[model samples]
Target: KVFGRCELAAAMKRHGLDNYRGYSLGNWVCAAKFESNFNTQATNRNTDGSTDYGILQINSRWWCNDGRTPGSRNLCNIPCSALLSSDITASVNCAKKIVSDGNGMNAWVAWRNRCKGTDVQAWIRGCRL
Candidate 1:
């Protein structure tokens, strides 16, 4: 519930992810760890000085000020809370669409390959549906 770190990881695993070795989730965790130690209610002003809100450090200007509202069907418009809700599956699905065009697993692999110093992303580039 509330899509905290462990819940988010579990959601990823349920969606066929074998690990959190690479992807936005990993990046999210890292960002959270570095930023606020995985506090879901974390908030920060980004380097460029924009307000980054919620668990994933989403920029409010982009998700809110750019004519995107909290519950808008348009992925770009949905709020950060919706993306970090207790319904982990919905959050993960929405996150996948918004961040990776539904290629979250691929993005994860890429993130893993690049950040984790592995060839996982390249290795699993096209094995998913």
Candidate 2:
């Protein structure tokens, strides 16, 4: 709900996400589509009994606590509700921290499943820098 694809790309650039830690903007762009269609308030519960929250669909187990999950790592030290906002700075910072982990974008099941080897240029095509 926060952005159209082009606007999202621009925002990502503002967040220093055109590339971060060697991952391309297109990489995150593709995963973001599958994650929430750029919706700031999106939430989904996965089959593993873990819930994904916000635009990046950050998981409850390691990112932040929704307070419903019994055990959570909350590596970002932010509330899950912090992600469900139009102001995405905190979420973007948190997302970068996530990719800094050893697995990188592989942390996103969506990225691993759908974007890992597929054509990714189109994800950011015509979106501008």
Candidate 3:
């Protein structure tokens, strides 16, 4: 599922992402836009021999069990394949779990470089949600 910007915003809000960790729905939407362009099946293999999966780009090194990443913590208790589902439930859950570690949205470098300190509201303008 490749989501539109506003569509992703509404879904994130419905999943309780608005202000989940002192960040707005726009912040999350912007992060997702840059992270994987809202593509559910997106995957990126890192140079460190780990892989990032799904819309939130949850990493195998610390978030999911890929059965291949070295030193995987599996902190989200889910398989990396789970994040590839079009439903995005697993990706959202893993992302929430990652944020709970206190890194905030900075856990994603895309958010840091693209969304952090920017007018994130622009990422979801004209959306009622």
Candidate 4:
């Protein structure tokens, strides 16, 4: 499956995100739709001449500072392809540590709601990104 709604949904579920309300699967889908049109292998060169890679539009240089490198094993050890390939529980759990910590999923949901226009900054400020 190159890319399908079911596949994407499955990926979300595998991450222990069975109850996606806001920034869950829908949020990821919307972000992907707005960012790269859901292109799993999408890659782009920014105005600063930096490359953003993969479905999640992860900037390789920002994470791993290597110039003009398409993909780095160290950085892409768990690429979006990998994230899409299996249950993302471990990955999502790990991501929570960096951002929202234990509240990552909740934060994700809130962010999604904000992005979808369901909740305005007036209702909840600083909910994005």
Candidate 5:
């Protein structure tokens, strides 16, 4: 769970995300680069006053509990801290739920604004899985 790009891709392959919701692994890879820079410990405070969770930056307003850092729809039904671990399972599972509920990786604004319709081949280049 060191979370290098290739490591993330390999983990995704291992975890059955080869075509997660029709997004290529590179799509999610590019997303992680922008979303969290592969740091599971990454967090962001949204303009709406909600907090973002780990790698994919799950939002507290809809996805998890920010302790009582407060304000959570807890739709992901997980402790936000669960996402902070490099293990990634909780975060990935929650993300699957989010994407499964709607439009693939477009569920993340980072992906929409930064990764969508952009060439992301470099994300997996020279990384043999």
Candidate 6:
């Protein structure tokens, strides 16, 4: 499922993404918009044969185990498929682990290019949450 801007913001906020690791709710909302356009089943293939999965696009190389990423560390200890589920609990859990691991929000290239050092608050301006 793809989420609307406000819907995604509310969903993410419900999962405690607001001010997580010093990143505001808008920062996460911005990352989701640019990473996968809020699609629950989004996927992207990297040159290294690793795959990025789900709304936040968690990578197979170090986060989720895909059974195909050569050096997958499964740092999040979750099956890659879990990241694509509509529940998003696994996705949110993995995203939290990624940031808590010290990777910060820069783990996603889209976040770096489109959200970092910007006024992401506009992303949730009308969400009322």
TM-score of predicted structure 2: 0.92
lDDT (Cα, tens digit) per residue for candidate 6, span 2-44: 8899988888889999999999999999999999999999999
Model 5 lDDT per residue over 14-129, tens place: 77666788877888788888999988999888887888878888988888987654545888888899999978889888988998986777779989999888887678888877
Q: lDDT values of the candidates? A: 0.44, 0.85, 0.88, 0.45, 0.83, 0.92
| Collision count for each candidate, in order | 4, 1, 0, 1, 0, 0
Q: What TM-score do all the candidates reach, one by one?
A: 0.45, 0.92, 0.96, 0.51, 0.90, 0.96
Q: Order of candidates by TM-score, top first?
A: 6, 3, 2, 5, 4, 1
Candidates by lDDT, descending order:
6, 3, 2, 5, 4, 1
Which residue pairs overlap in candidate 5's backbone? none
lDDT of 3 by residue, 26-76 (tens): 899988889899998899999999999999898899989999987778999
Q: Native-vs-model 2 lDDT?
A: 0.85
Candidate 3: C-alpha lDDT: 0.88
Off by over 4 Å in 3: none
**lDDT (tens digit, per residue) of candidate 2 on 1-129:** 667887888788889987698888888888888888889899998676668888899988889878877766899988899999998787799999999988899988889999889988788788766
Best by lDDT: 6
In model 4, pairs of residues that clash are 23-109
Candidate 3's TM-score reads 0.96
Higher-scoring candidate on TM-score, 3 or 5: 3
State which candidate, 2 or 4, has the greater TM-score.
2
Looking at candidate 2, what is the lDDT of residue 67?
86
Is 1 or 5 the stronger prediction by lDDT? 5
Pitting candidate 4 against candidate 5, the one with the higher TM-score is: 5
Give one digit per residue, the lDDT tens place, for model 4 in 17-90: 44333344455544544544555556676676666544455554433343454544334344334433234443
TM-score, prediction 6: 0.96
